[PDB]
Amino acid sequence: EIAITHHVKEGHEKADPSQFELLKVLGQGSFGKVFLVKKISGSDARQLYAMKVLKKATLKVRDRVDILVEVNHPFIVKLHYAFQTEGKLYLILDFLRGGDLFTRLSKEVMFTEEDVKFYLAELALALDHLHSLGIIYRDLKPENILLDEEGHIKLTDFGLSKEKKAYSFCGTVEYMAPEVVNRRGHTQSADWWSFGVLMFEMLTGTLPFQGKDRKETMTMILKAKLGMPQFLSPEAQSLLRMLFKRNPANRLGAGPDGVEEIKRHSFFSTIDWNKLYRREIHPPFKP
Numbered sequence: 001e002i003a004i005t006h007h008v009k010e011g012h013e014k015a016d017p018s019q020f021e022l023l024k025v026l027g028q029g030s031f032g033k034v035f036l037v038k039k040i041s042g043s044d045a046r047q048l049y050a051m052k053v054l055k056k057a058t059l060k061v062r063d064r065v066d067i068l069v070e071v072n073h074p075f076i077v078k079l080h081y082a083f084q085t086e087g088k089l090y091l092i093l094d095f096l097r098g099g100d101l102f103t104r105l106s107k108e109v110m111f112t113e114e115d116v117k118f119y120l121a122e123l124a125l126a127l128d129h130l131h132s133l134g135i136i137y138r139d140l141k142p143e144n145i146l147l148d149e150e151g152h153i154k155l156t157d158f159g160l161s162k163e164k165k166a167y168s169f170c171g172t173v174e175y176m177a178p179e180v181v182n183r184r185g186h187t188q189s190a191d192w193w194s195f196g197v198l199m200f201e202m203l204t205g206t207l208p209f210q211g212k213d214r215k216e217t218m219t220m221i222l223k224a225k226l227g228m229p230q231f232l233s234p235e236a237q238s239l240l241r242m243l244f245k246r247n248p249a250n251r252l253g254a255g256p257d258g259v260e261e262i263k264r265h266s267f268f269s270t271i272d273w274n275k276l277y278r279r280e281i282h283p284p285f286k287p
């Protein structure tokens, strides 16, 4: 069973089925049946959204950590509303025409370092923006990563997990930083570890810390010395080593400059971050 985690923005305006006008019904391939709807009332009145109605899905609602009104970010899709009605979970999301799953692509292609620079660069901008909004992922993973019709990254701003006793947080262990596995407290720097795991997996098609079972994987995340694939460039190896520091205080991205520590790394030296943000760099793969 799926659990959706909604990180609600402060001053969130709770919703229900009656705040939405049905406009269209679409078949969106891997997304299944999607309703195009129009918000009737509130700050976002008249805004068009995608609506998903899930049978048997759990909703978890979490708080995030100047009175600003949010605007779109080029590499994020947002969950604006999530509410339960008669056994059904309604999700109101940014409309994503022709969207697809990153995992669909990753299964089909062999990424080079050049390819990964592009996807990780968009992902870094997205993740940092979520951090600024007060969202901490904990187990950022490929299921959180979509591609738009143009092949650009769309990071979901909501959590997705597969769920005898219920847990408030069900994380995919392979993507969790040591301090998260410890449950002894963590910050946004945990997500940069996960960013490193994503990078490692993109480059190698394997996970860096993987045991026979959750318990062993956890042991490995805490104590396992990572065998760095030698085919990787010095720059790739350097970035991975700096993201996989077990002490979060020493981890790249943990300093006051946060994501800039990553953006400044030699692995990303070819990236023009302003052109990237403007969506003026073409993806390695076009859907």
Ligand SMILES: CC(=O)O[C@@H]1[C@@H](OC(C)=O)[C@@H](O)[C@H](Oc2c(-c3ccc(O)cc3)oc3cc(O)cc(O)c3c2=O)O[C@H]1C
Residues within 6 Å of the ligand: 002, 028, 030, 031, 032, 034, 050, 051, 052, 054, 077, 078, 091, 093, 094, 095, 096, 099, 101, 142, 143, 144, 145, 146, 156, 160
């Ligand atoms: C595991 C789960 O329940 O994910 C579901 C999707 O289900 C599956 C099997 O693809 C699909 O119903 C649908 O897919 C969408 C997704 C999505 C799909 C797979 C993921 O791993 C993550 C997200 O994201 C959207 C984002 C938007 O901005 C607008 C959408 O309509 C969808 C959108 O329709 O909604 C998801 C919440």
